[PDB]
Amino acid sequence: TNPPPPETSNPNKPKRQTNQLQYLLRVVLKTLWKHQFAWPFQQPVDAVKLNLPDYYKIIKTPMDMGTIKKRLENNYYWNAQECIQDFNTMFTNCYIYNKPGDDIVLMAEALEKLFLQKINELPT
Ligand SMILES: Cc1nnc2n1-c1ccc(-c3ccc(N)nc3)cc1N(c1ccc(Cl)cc1)C[C@H]2C
């Protein structure tokens, strides 16, 4: 089956607004969300719907842009590096589950390239 999604809000966690977290939501996430190849990555992988029974046998740290949006907008992250780590986890999952040169791998690679260009611009 599917696991519950990752945790996305917790009112016991301390909250802060930073320039870098603001950029990651308002600029980074937005540009990725509207990319041609964003659609597979906008919500948790639904392994039941897609008939991928081994997806969560292989991928033990799930992540998707939907979850990352929820974490940014709920002030779940304290450090910008947490969010960057989550985007990395998302791309890496796709590379782990799939194989070099698969269509979805090319799409993730191109998304990652745009994420890297956008992070280059992260404000201080
Ligand atoms: C992300 C990711 N990492 N691996 C996968 N995915 C993936 C997630 C969601 C979908 C998907 C597929 C159909 C649909 N209606 N909504 C979402 C397809 C995927 N996959 C996918 C998406 C696009 C293309 Cl062209 C091929 C495979 C394959 C699947 C194993």
Side-chain angles (χ1 to χ4, degrees):
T1 77
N2 291 317
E7 177 180 27
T8 50
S9 67
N10 182 327
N12 297 328
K13 274 160 148 252
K15 289 201 273 184
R16 67 175 181 175
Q17 292 128 333
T18 77
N19 291 349
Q20 283 191 336
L21 290 160
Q22 285 170 17
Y23 176 88
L24 282 165
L25 183 56
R26 297 198 292 217
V27 176
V28 181
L29 194 284
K30 165 215 216 90
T31 317
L32 292 162
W33 195 271
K34 315 163 171 213
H35 190 277
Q36 187 91 17
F37 300 150
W39 60 269
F41 301 96
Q42 284 173 345
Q43 62 284 309
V45 179
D46 194 324
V48 169
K49 271 254 262 146
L50 294 171
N51 200 359
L52 311 163
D54 58 343
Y55 185 86
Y56 296 110
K57 284 184 270 245
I58 287 289
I59 295 302
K60 306 302 202 189
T61 301
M63 192 49 55
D64 67 280
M65 288 207 305
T67 292
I68 290 162
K69 178 175 182 287
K70 289 172 178 205
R71 285 174 171 200
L72 285 160
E73 75 200 359
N74 296 331
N75 313 288
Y76 181 91
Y77 302 125
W78 185 254
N79 295 324
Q81 191 49 45
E82 293 176 74
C83 174
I84 292 158
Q85 189 201 114
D86 284 346
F87 270 101
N88 285 321
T89 294
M90 185 183 85
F91 297 131
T92 288
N93 291 349
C94 180
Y95 315 150
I96 287 171
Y97 183 72
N98 302 285
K99 301 304 128 218
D102 279 348
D103 293 341
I104 193 50
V105 172
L106 281 310
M107 291 170 72
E109 289 168 353
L111 294 166
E112 181 184 38
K113 293 174 192 268
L114 174 56
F115 175 67
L116 294 168
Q117 287 310 134
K118 290 308 185 173
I119 287 318
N120 183 48
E121 306 294 36
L122 192 70
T124 33

